């Protein structure tokens, strides 16, 4: 019937919706910093916008290694054991600090990068100051991600959105204290926003720890009672699970960087519309990612409960819901490609060219939604390895050469950005096609074999 499926589709949304608010208010910090740093110059607004382009991928690579804790914790809760739950958390933190060792190194190498980009000193001396101010937050951002990954793994999502929203609401007024040199605080024109970001991240971490200690819903775990110690044998287990998830993100970012370099030979009016279209296609990526995150915790719960039909129905309903939301937002983007391009910019040639790229951005949305929901469902099964192979093959072997063939080389008149966007679409379709096949192969296996694989 349909009274058995719908219940699941009521759970999933109830899990997926809060995460979205906790993920929208994460780019709000960068946006607010950039906007408030432009009310004092256009040198500052372009100095804290370069420094937010080296910070974000560097911290995403670090976060990617702590996203393998969600299935590990959610499966123990389903199996009903729960008394191994405090042991894994105390390991995750020991990992988080360690993965802040390389990042803080690479950020100190910021200078050698900007002089590689042909940047004048008048804003280099501001970008370096901003980066040195924000390095004090990667110890308190990765730990907060580990704690949030725990609370999500416990099928409890509320304490993330509230804390993120409070963080942003405390970021807005506390920039104006340190930017406009007020209340006996440094003038600090373009680095005050970095200092405000560090302070608000530390406050959010402290509030989350206070909630974890006091909450009456987690009291049956007794989390902060032991003083456990690291052990390499068990800790290498988490690294093997977590590495491919980070590798896929790294290769995706490098692909998006290389495409811009190949488009640079064209006019500076072409690259601006490409950047606008890509930025907007990255903003509306949050809905399928949130649905994937909800499916990931839901699928690992059923397999912990020694139930497999529950995992199958969870994955299928996740796919259907991701497809439906992709379709609705693609229609709402195609119907409204007038006002947003005018929100972004002012030149009418730039808007007249970006209206053409939004058409392909709609198909891009509709395809990557299915791709990412399938990837989340596969991550539910602790199969973190096949994702990397399949997405790397579908990105850098089919996605990239086909863009160049339809673009520069003038085979098959030359096409500009549109050839590259068609290359993106081909890569995404191939990735979705192979991940679906892998999921079906893994879903048509015996109960013992599938559980054993999910047990490891």
């Amino acid at each position, epitope marked *: 019937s349909v009274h058995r499926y719908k219940k699941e589709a009521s759970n999933l949304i109830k899990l997926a919706t809060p995460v979205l608010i906790a993920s929208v208010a994460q780019t709000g910090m960068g946006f607010v910093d950039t906007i408030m740093a432009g009310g004092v110059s256009a040198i500052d607004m*372009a100095a804290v916008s370069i420094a937010a382009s080296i910070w974000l991928p560097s911290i995403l690579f670090g976060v990617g290694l702590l996203m393998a804790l969600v299935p590990v914790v959610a499966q123990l809760n389903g199996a009903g054991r729960q008394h191994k739950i405090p042991f894994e958390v105390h390991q995750g933190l020991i990992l988080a600090l360690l993965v802040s060792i390389p990042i803080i190194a690479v950020l100190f190498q910021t200078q050698f990068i900007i002089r590689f980009m042909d940047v004048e000193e008048a804003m280099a001396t501001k970008t370096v100051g901003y980066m040195h101010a924000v390095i004090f937050a990667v110890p308190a951002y990765l730990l907060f991600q580990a704690l949030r990954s725990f609370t999500d793994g416990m099928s409890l999502t509320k304490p993330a959105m509230v804390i993120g929203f409070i963080g942003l609401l405390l970021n807005i007024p506390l920039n104006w204290i340190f930017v406009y040199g007020k209340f006996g605080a440094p003038e600090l024109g373009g680095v005050g926003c970095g200092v405000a970001t560090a302070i608000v991240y530390w406050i959010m971490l402290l509030l989350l720890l206070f909630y974890i200690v006091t909450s009456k819903r987690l009291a049956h775990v007794k989390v902060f009672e032991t003083f456990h110690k690291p052990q390499p044998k068990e800790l290498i287990r988490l690294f093997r699970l977590g590495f491919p998830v980070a590798a896929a993100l790294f290769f995706e970012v490098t692909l998006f960087a290389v495409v811009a370099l190949l488009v640079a030979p064209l006019g500076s009016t072409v690259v601006a519309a490409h950047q606008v279209a890509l930025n907007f296609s990255s903003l509306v990526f949050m809905f399928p990612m949130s649905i994937g995150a909800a499916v990931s915790i839901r699928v690992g719960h059923k397999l912990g409960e020694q139930d497999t039909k529950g995992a199958a129905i969870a994955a299928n309903v996740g796919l259907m819901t991701g497809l439906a939301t992709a379709c609705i937002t693609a229609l709402l983007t195609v119907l409204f490609r007038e006002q947003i391009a005018l929100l972004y910019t002012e030149n009418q040639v730039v808007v007249a060219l970006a209206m053409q790229l939004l058409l392909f951005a709609a198909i891009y949305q509709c395809m990557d939604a299915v791709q990412v929901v399938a990837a989340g469902s596969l991550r539910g099964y602790k199969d973190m390895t096949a994702i990397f192979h399949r997405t790397f093959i579908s990105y850098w072997v089919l996605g990239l050469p086909t863009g160049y063939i339809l673009g520069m080389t003038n085979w098959l008149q030359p096409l500009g950005a549109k050839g590259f966007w068609l290359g993106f679409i081909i890569g995404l379709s191939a990735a979705a096609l192979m991940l679906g096949q892998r999921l079906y192969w893994l879903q048509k296996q015996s109960d013992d074999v599938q559980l054993h694989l999910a047990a490891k």
Partner: nanobody
Framework: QRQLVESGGGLVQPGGSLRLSCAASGIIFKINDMGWFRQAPGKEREGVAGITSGGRTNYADSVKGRFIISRDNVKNTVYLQMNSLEPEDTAVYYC????????????????WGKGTPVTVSS
């Protein structure tokens, strides 16, 4: 040329005053720096004032006390009030604007003007 246009320059006796105005189109102007430049024959282009998106005017050394740069945001224009002119202020004055092209970019874009001549003599 098309983004920036200047107007208001003409002949004026020594000890007189002018008012140049630069009107910008196709530019956000809320997040842009501004500035005026001059170039006299035989010499080279050199800065003469500058305002940065919130104030903090940046006059030149041989210019302070006579030139007062201001900006107006409701109708996007930049002014420059010339006072106590002298025979050495004769040149063609340019307008310049730099800032982000859109809210999604990271590098600055610079646009020039065609210039308006000013000639001071008896």
């Amino acid at each position: 040329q098309r983004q920036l246009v200047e107007s208001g320059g003409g002949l004026v006796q020594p000890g007189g005053s002018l008012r140049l105005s630069c009107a910008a189109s196709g530019i956000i102007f809320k997040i842009n720096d501004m500035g005026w430049f001059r170039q006299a024959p035989g010499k080279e282009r050199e800065g003469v004032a500058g305002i940065t998106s919130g104030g903090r005017t940046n006059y030149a050394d041989s210019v302070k006390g006579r030139f007062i740069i201001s900006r107006d945001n409701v109708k996007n224009t930049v002014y420059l009030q010339m006072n106590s002119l002298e025979p050495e202020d004769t040149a063609v004055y340019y307008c310049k604007s730099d800032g982000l092209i859109s809210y999604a970019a990271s590098q600055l874009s610079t646009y020039w003007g065609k210039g308006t001549p000013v000639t001071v003599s008896s």
